[PDB]
Each structure stands twice: as structure tokens, then as C-alpha cells.
Amino acid sequence: VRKLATIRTAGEITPIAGAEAIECCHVDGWTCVIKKGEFKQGDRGVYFEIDSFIKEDNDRYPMLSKQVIDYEGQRGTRLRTARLRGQLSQGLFLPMDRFPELASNQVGDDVTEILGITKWEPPISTNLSGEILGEFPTFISKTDQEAVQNLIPQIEENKGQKFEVTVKLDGSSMTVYRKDDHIGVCGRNWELRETATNAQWHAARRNKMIEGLQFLNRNLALQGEIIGESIQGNLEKLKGQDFYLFDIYDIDKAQYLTPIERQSLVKQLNDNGFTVKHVPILDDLELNHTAEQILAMADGPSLNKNVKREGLVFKRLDGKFSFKAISNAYLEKHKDR
């Protein structure tokens, strides 16, 4: 997981025409509204990303005062995407002289624990939050993806590489895995017990993927998104619920399969009557883009080609560098994300 609060550098600062108390600060690939004169280009500050939850503290955080709410039994503010007078704003960026306990930290430091910042999350469905069997397997990587806005040097340093481009479906991450004599089914954070009502187990039995892992005889984690009815508002307008694969983790080797290895294995499972669906795949992209350009492609058709998708995921063909681009128009349309 993640660095919600980090020391970064003011990029170009541009005037927000009309409202003269404020200006727009570019912070890596993010765009952030600041008060005028608060930073100049090159100044360092603490950048709080969207989804940070910042505890009530009007000494340090008076600009969060009217948006204080109660979340997991604590008073404080969830940082969220906003469009103000045409101006896209995401995150909070405070100059370093507001944090005297950080005067010895360096640019790029992860200061999230030191500052007490927590991660906000949408509530989980009744059937996705079944009965917990244990921890998420520590021998499986989780399905988190780094945002393109946080990868400016890595994006320029990947020009000419080729990427599998998939649609990000808006559901719940799910993992079905075999390790030796154990086959498990997990949600986003816990391994779950099979019951007649558990959504993830039901999806896994319905597309036979537990039999598929038994057939394959390998220590593999199939990872994908469960989507459908009563899951995150069912953007795709499905009947029932279904699993869509986007990754397969080689447990013995501790690396994800490459895109073509993954397609190979999906082909093999379907050939043997284990029909697992894949998230929609678009044309491979040869990278030569800016983050702003990547974000520009995020909007478009989803699995259901008549709805607007959450974004895109990009996976380099060697399976060694992956990132996501969340559609900003999608975050303006749904304010519970």
C-alpha cells in the first residue's frame, strides 16, 4: 500500500483566472489548488493525496474545517476530487514550514505515519464482507496499482516499452489461489470461509476456477474483479455477479505472469472447460506519452460499452512495471469514490 502524505516539489504554478486569492499548483502529475504566494515553483511541501483521511485539527488544518465528518469513529476530513469553476483539484499541499517536526526530512520522504494520516475507503457490501478465515496470504501480492500521477520519471523512463491496456472494472478485488493442498478464496484483504451466501466463493464455483486450479496443479493465484449487482453500484448493469481476471501471481516464483503467459493460461483453462472471464483488453500501447496524456485516455467505454469506465490499467509486456490511470470524469460523476 501507500504513501498518502509525502514531501514533494511545487511544479508549475498557474493563475486560476477569476478568483485572485488562489492559484493552481502542479505536484508531480497531480493538480492542486493552493493559496496565492503559498508556494513558488521549486518549493517543497507535504502533499496529501486524495483518499487521505486527516484527523480534525484546525490548528494545522483549518482549510479542512467545514468538511469535517465522522468516519470509523473519528472526526476529520476525507480528501476527495473536486472541480471548482472548471478547475480540477486533487489533494492538499502544505509548505514545509507548517511541519517543524519535518525540518530534517528530505524531498520524497514518506511522512504519512509521522503525520497521522489514514486511508479512507468506501463501505463494503454485506456479501463481500463474509466470514474471515484468516489473513490475506502473505505469499500472494495484493492487487493494488500505483497511480500514473505518481510516476512521472518512470513514465518518461518507459518510452518505447509496450503495455497491455485493460479496462479497470469497478467492483471488489478477489483472489482465488492454490498453494499445495490448500485452495482458498479471498476478498481484498482477508481469506474467506465458503458459505452459501459468500459472493466470492459463489463467483469462483460458478466459473469453475477452483476446479481449474486443481486441474492446473500449480501454485497460482488468480486475481480479478468481482462485479455485478449490489457491488459498487453495478456500473456495468449486470445480472448477478461475476469474476473477471486481470492478473495471475506465480506463488512459487513470487512474480506475476506476463500478459501473454496469462493469456496462454486462460486459453488452457477455457480449452479444458474452465471458462474464466478476463477484464476487457484493448490495443497494446507503445508508451511515448505524458501523464496528462495517459490520464486523457482513461475515459471511454467499459465492459458494457454504453457506460463510462473507471479508468485503465497498464501492464508492461515483461510483467515488471504496472500502473493505473483513473478517469477523472469518472470521479466527478460518482462522489462516493
Side-chain angles (χ1 to χ4, degrees):
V1 278
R2 217 153 70 156
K3 329 211 250 194
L4 301 165
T6 72
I7 296 174
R8 320 193 186 201
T9 310
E12 49 163 353
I13 283 167
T14 38
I16 300 174
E20 271 263 43
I22 51 166
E23 44 192 1
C24 165
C25 192
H26 297 247
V27 180
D28 286 337
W30 301 103
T31 278
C32 190
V33 169
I34 61 176
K35 308 290 115 182
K36 272 197 169 112
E38 252 196 321
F39 302 80
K40 291 261 294 191
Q41 175 172 319
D43 282 1
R44 272 64 190 265
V46 180
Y47 179 74
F48 310 74
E49 300 189 18
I50 56 175
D51 308 328
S52 317
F53 182 88
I54 302 172
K55 294 192 201 173
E56 178 170 59
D57 183 349
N58 66 307
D59 302 321
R60 171 159 281 183
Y61 302 111
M63 68 299 284
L64 305 185
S65 87
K66 303 212 162 163
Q67 47 179 314
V68 181
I69 60 146
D70 309 313
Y71 172 76
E72 304 321 343
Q74 195 63 290
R75 285 214 72 86
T77 292
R78 163 207 174 190
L79 293 203
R80 54 209 268 253
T81 295
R83 202 178 202 65
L84 52 144
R85 263 197 210 80
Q87 177 63 252
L88 170 67
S89 172
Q90 283 170 315
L92 174 60
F93 194 40
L94 298 183
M96 297 304 306
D97 59 58
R98 276 96 182 280
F99 310 83
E101 76 271 34
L102 303 175
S104 266
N105 289 93
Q106 311 302 334
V107 66
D109 278 348
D110 181 0
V111 294
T112 305
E113 225 194 339
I114 298 105
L115 292 180
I117 310 297
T118 76
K119 179 175 128 202
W120 174 92
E121 264 172 87
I124 188 185
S125 148
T126 279
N127 282 39
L128 301 180
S129 189
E131 308 145 282
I132 297 185
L133 199 141
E135 46 170 12
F136 191 91
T138 72
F139 51 83
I140 302 175
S141 155
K142 281 176 171 165
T143 66
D144 291 312
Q145 285 287 339
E146 184 68 272
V148 68
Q149 293 95 323
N150 296 330
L151 291 156
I152 310 292
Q154 296 80 356
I155 283 311
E156 180 45 17
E157 207 176 18
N158 267 269
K159 176 196 186 203
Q161 304 296 323
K162 286 201 308 134
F163 294 76
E164 172 202 73
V165 181
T166 48
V167 179
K168 197 189 173 327
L169 312 176
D170 187 1
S172 189
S173 169
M174 157 174 171
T175 289
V176 184
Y177 79 89
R178 178 189 184 275
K179 181 163 196 287
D180 306 320
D181 70 302
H182 180 77
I183 276 168
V185 176
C186 309
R188 193 203 167 184
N189 285 302
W190 305 104
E191 168 158 2
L192 311 173
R193 332 176 182 273
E194 170 160 43
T195 76
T197 193
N198 178 264
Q200 293 94 335
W201 271 96
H202 182 7
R205 300 291 196 176
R206 175 204 220 198
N207 74 352
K208 274 341 170 172
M209 60 205 294
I210 281 155
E211 289 167 35
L213 281 171
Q214 288 163 339
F215 164 83
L216 282 172
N217 213 94
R218 289 178 63 184
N219 285 347
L220 292 176
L222 311 175
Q223 299 183 302
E225 198 83 355
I226 182 173
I227 63 171
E229 283 172 301
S230 316
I231 297 178
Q232 287 274 288
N234 194 16
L235 184 91
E236 311 299 325
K237 302 160 168 198
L238 265 39
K239 291 280 207 305
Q241 310 168 331
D242 229 339
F243 171 88
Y244 294 75
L245 189 96
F246 48 65
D247 258 319
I248 298 166
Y249 195 65
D250 195 315
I251 293 176
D252 289 352
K253 279 303 122 207
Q255 61 181 119
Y256 281 103
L257 304 206
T258 84
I260 57 110
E261 289 178 341
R262 172 157 32 82
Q263 302 307 111
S264 281
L265 207 42
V266 167
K267 171 67 138 49
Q268 180 166 13
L269 289 151
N270 288 274
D271 282 355
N272 284 264
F274 315 113
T275 49
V276 200
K277 299 173 184 188
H278 201 277
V279 297
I281 301 186
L282 311 180
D283 296 316
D284 289 0
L285 186 82
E286 177 166 44
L287 199 64
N288 194 337
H289 301 61
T290 69
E292 188 198 0
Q293 261 165 274
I294 298 306
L295 284 168
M297 333 190 308
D299 202 14
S302 183
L303 171 63
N304 181 343
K305 302 286 146 200
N306 317 127
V307 296
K308 296 327 293 267
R309 67 194 170 213
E310 186 185 2
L312 295 174
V313 176
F314 300 78
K315 302 200 182 67
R316 204 167 68 188
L317 260 48
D318 62 353
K320 286 322 173 153
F321 173 61
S322 64
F323 63 87
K324 68 173 174 204
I326 287 181
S327 155
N328 282 324
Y330 186 91
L331 306 161
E332 281 102 53
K333 188 170 183 62
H334 321 281
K335 308 272 217 287
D336 40 347
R337 312 294 167 222

